[PDB]
């Protein structure tokens, strides 16, 4: 396993224009496209993205290549943060997957803001990251993926993989 194989377990892949859990227009694997209520302009968005006229459909070779631009983006986001950077240098493989997962979905901002956990996760409590971490409006919008990102966490293990939220987009 791997952080593609995750990511892909967790967004699923749709070829159409879709809704994410917070209503936001979004398509491919997790690709956001815009938190405004306009499908014109996340259809707009799509066409800047993909470099044609899409009408709101794209092959799965395109969404694929979002896919792995939307990877490296949130790595390069941990890179570039004060705060993420420090712990993501900290953790072992396993677990810095589980870090990268949780920036694709809420930001680097969002998970920057995870100030305590983070702590945690930087000094190896992992059973009490895991409580900090459900404490959380994440946890409790999309449990069933929080659940196996914290389980992740927790033993530095795929065991979970053997509830999509955000990324990338105006």
């Known amino acids: ?17 879709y809704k994410d859990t917070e209503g936001y227009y979004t398509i491919g694997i997790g690709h956001l496209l815009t938190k405004s209520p ?16 899409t009408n709101g459909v794209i092959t799965k070779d ?10 490296d983006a ?11 950077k420090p712990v993501y240098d900290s953790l072992d493989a396993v ?33 009490e990251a895991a409580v900090n971490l459900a404490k959380s409006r994440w946890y409790n919008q999309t449990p069933n993926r929080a659940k196996r990102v914290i389980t ?9 993989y053997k509830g999509i939220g955000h990324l990338l987009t105006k």
């Open 38 to 53: 306009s499908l014109n302009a996340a259809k707009s968005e799509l066409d800047k993205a993909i470099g044609r006229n």
């Open 152 to 160: 992740t966490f927790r033993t530095g293990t795929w065991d979970a």
């Open 62 to 71: 395109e969404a694929e290549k979002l896919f792995n631009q939307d990877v």
């Open 1 to 17: 396993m791997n952080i593609f194989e995750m990511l892909r377990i967790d967004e699923g892949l749709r070829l159409k224009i």
């Open 74 to 84: 949130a790595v390069r986001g941990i890179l570039r943060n004060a705060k993420l």
């Open 95 to 127: 677990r810095r997957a589980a870090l990268i997962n949780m920036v694709f979905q809420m930001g680097e901002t969002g998970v920057a803001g995870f100030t305590n956990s983070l702590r945690m996760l930087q000094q190896k409590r992992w059973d």
